[PDB]
Amino acid sequence: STRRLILVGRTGAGKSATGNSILGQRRFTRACTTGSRRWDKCHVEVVDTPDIFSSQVSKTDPGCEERGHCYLLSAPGPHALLLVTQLGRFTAQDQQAVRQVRDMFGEDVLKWMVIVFTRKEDLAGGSLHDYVSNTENRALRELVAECGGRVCAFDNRATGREQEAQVVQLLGMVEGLVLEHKGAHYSNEVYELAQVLRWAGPEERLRRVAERVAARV
Ligand SMILES: Nc1nc2c(ncn2[C@@H]2O[C@H](COP(=O)(O)OP(=O)(O)O)[C@@H](O)[C@H]2O)c(=O)[nH]1
Ligand SMILES: [Mg+2]
Numbered sequence: 001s002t003r004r005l006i007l008v009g010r011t012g013a014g015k016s017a018t019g020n021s022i023l024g025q026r027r028f029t030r031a032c033t034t035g036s037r038r039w040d041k042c043h044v045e046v047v048d049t050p051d052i053f054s055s056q057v058s059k060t061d062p063g064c065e066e067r068g069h070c071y072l073l074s075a076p077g078p079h080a081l082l083l084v085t086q087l088g089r090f091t092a093q094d095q096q097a098v099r100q101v102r103d104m105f106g107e108d109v110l111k112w113m114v115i116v117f118t119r120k121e122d123l124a125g126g127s128l129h130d131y132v133s134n135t136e137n138r139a140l141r142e143l144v145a146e147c148g149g150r151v152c153a154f155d156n157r158a159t160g161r162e163q164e165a166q167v168v169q170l171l172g173m174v175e176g177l178v179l180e181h182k183g184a185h186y187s188n189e190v191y192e193l194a195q196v197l198r199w200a201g202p203e204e205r206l207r208r209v210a211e212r213v214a215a216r217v
Helices: 015-023 065-074 092-105 107-112 128-134 138-146 160-180 189-199 202-216
Strands: 002-008 033-039 042-048 080-086 113-118 151-153
Touching (some): 015 113, 015 160, 080 092, 092 202, 113 160
Parallel strands (some): 113 151
16 A cells, blocks of 8 residues: 655665666655655665765764654654665765665664666676676675565666566565565654654754654764
């Protein structure tokens, strides 16, 4: 009935392009933004993210207002976090983005995480399972295992049936994950505060949610 996804990862990973592919729209910038698509009888909601996963987030988003906005847009919690990364370019910056995500949501959030690889065409027609299996990048290897081997490849220039197939594959994985959690979305003490304060006005809700995020990072 509803699937809430959040796109996370470094700047230039391909978050915005991936979101456009999923939504089938040219939808996706200092702020979090959102889009959605009605598929069958399911409402797929995608939150795209700005520069909030760098080592400079502390200077870019000092009172955690933008990190707070991400929570409000995804409340009561995501069914999956999509960690977007570029095929052949898993860098120190990608590793920094993963740590920011952990800091921002909690260690348990990797149990709701799917890794999306952009630039699929760089496999030159070869499979992703082989590429993931034979990479010399230890840190990528580790991350894939921490995310239960949930990996998926996108060519964000794909249109037509090639695009439908990559999106269908990703949504299948998200369903798999949701069933693993017996239908539960990810939650923590910040999402709970957002829900508790759901009757309050948007200004106090944002202020108090930003405040809870700041206390934990
Ligand atoms: N060739 C190719 N380019 C891509 C793909 N995905 C993203 N890009 C390009 O990578 C650049 C950064 O992507 P963007 O979505 O803006 O990254 P973001 O900062 O993570 O939102 C853009 O110029 C995209 O066109 C892909 O699958 N194939
Ligand atoms: Mg972007």
